[PDB]
Amino acid sequence: RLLDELTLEGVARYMQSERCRRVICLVGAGISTSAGIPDFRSPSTGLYDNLEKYHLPYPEAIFEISYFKKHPEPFFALAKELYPGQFKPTICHYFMRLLKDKGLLLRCYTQNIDTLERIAGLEQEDLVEAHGTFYTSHCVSASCRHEYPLSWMKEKIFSEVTPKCEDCQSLVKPDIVFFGESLPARFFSCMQSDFLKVDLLLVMGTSLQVQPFASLISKAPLSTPRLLINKEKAGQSDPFLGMIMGLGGGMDFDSKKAYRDVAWLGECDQGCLALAELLGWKKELEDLVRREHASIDAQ
Ligand SMILES: Nc1ncnc2c1ncn2[C@@H]1O[C@H](COP(=O)(O)OP(=O)(O)OC[C@H]2O[C@H](O)[C@H](O)[C@@H]2O)[C@@H](O)[C@H]1O
Ligand SMILES: O=c1c(O)c(-c2ccc(O)c(O)c2)oc2cc(O)cc(O)c12
Ligand SMILES: [Zn+2]
């Protein structure tokens, strides 16, 4: 067993050790709340509780490939409102940038498309955008698959014109991953390689409520420590009919057999602060936030 004790202090004791060379960051929507962007499943503030005006039979419809193909207007409506684009990466995003600078970051797997991992200074090679990107767009026909650049989507969304392939006249959507779609190839190729050599899973701002991304915690070695920094406990529950996770594929924080998994409950910003400090990196993180935020105001 690699953790001297199931607390934040014993994770930072582990990170200082020789034995901790390669960290995989698994992140979700809660790393981007403190920078102004609401998540999906939080009650009342979550996007899923704020789609009434589309009179959707249920909220996940707006990001489902079959609902989309029949009623594409709801989604295109949201996508403009989705992207004001005036958002700064949080403390939590820089912490991952620090991991990069410390030679500690094997990868960050993100469920977000708000692009703040990239604006925080992680590179395309440090990053798997698990759930796609707005950067490019494609025709939804499997035989055509025509690609259109950021501008071409941008210009049809604020036209208020439902985008349509020039070649086949089918719907064109941004390369965000909808329910029913494939995840990009980079996800599997990186996965099969990355999880063979991982020493710490750091899991931030996610409810682990979708597959395949919720599988990732089960892919690390049985002895790899797994720290959650989240408002609630995520990945830990009694089985039920319709659970998302595999049998015994989840976190064990609290049971008598618990050995390697730690939950820190609270703000993603403050945990990252409290780990940095333990690790003696407080000022270094604060200074890089202060600088990088000044640097954006000015550009
Ligand atoms: N500041 C905060 N600090 C810590 N945790 C936070 C904070 N704010 C929110 N949380 C927690 O952060 C978590 C947010 O969970 P969810 O909103 O489901 O986001 P996803 O990223 O998992 O959604 C995954 C996919 O589902 C979608 O369809 C798309 O396809 C997404 O890509 C909760 O447990 C919050 O308590
Ligand atoms: O909207 C849907 C939905 O909510 C559920 C579902 C999931 C878990 C549960 O516990 C439950 O009661 C329902 O399944 C679905 C299956 C589909 O093929 C299409 C859908 O649109 C839904
Ligand atoms: Zn086409």
Author numbering: 57 to 355
What did the study's authors say about this model?
Sirtuins are NAD+-dependent protein lysine deacylases that sense the cellular nutrient status, regulate energy metabolism and stress responses, and have been implicated in aging processes and aging-related diseases. Sirtuins feature differing substrate acyl selectivities. Here, we analyse modulation of Sirt6 and other isoforms by quercetin and its derivatives in activity and binding assays and through crystal structure analyses of modulator complexes of Sirt6 and Sirt2.
Due to the lack of a Sirt6-like binding site in the other isoforms, quercetin has to exploit an alternative binding site to cause this opposite, inhibitory effect. To identify the alternative quercetin binding site and modulation mechanism, we determined a crystal structure of a Sirt2/quercetin complex at 2.2 Å resolution. Well-defined electron density revealed that quercetin binds at the Sirt2 active site entrance, through π-π stacking with Tyr-114 and Phe-235 and anion–π interactions with Glu-116 and Glu-120. Interestingly, quercetin is located between two symmetry-related Sirt2 monomers and interacts with the same surface region of the second monomer, albeit with rotated orientation and through fewer contacts, suggesting the interaction with the first monomer to be the one relevant in solution. Comparing the Sirt2/quercetin complex to other Sirtuin isoforms reveals that its binding site is also accessible in Sirt1, 3, and 5, whereas it is occupied in Sirt6 by the N-terminus. Since the quercetin binding site of Sirt6 is blocked in these other isoforms, our structures define two mutually exclusive modulator binding sites for Sirt6 and for Sirt1,2,3,5, respectively.
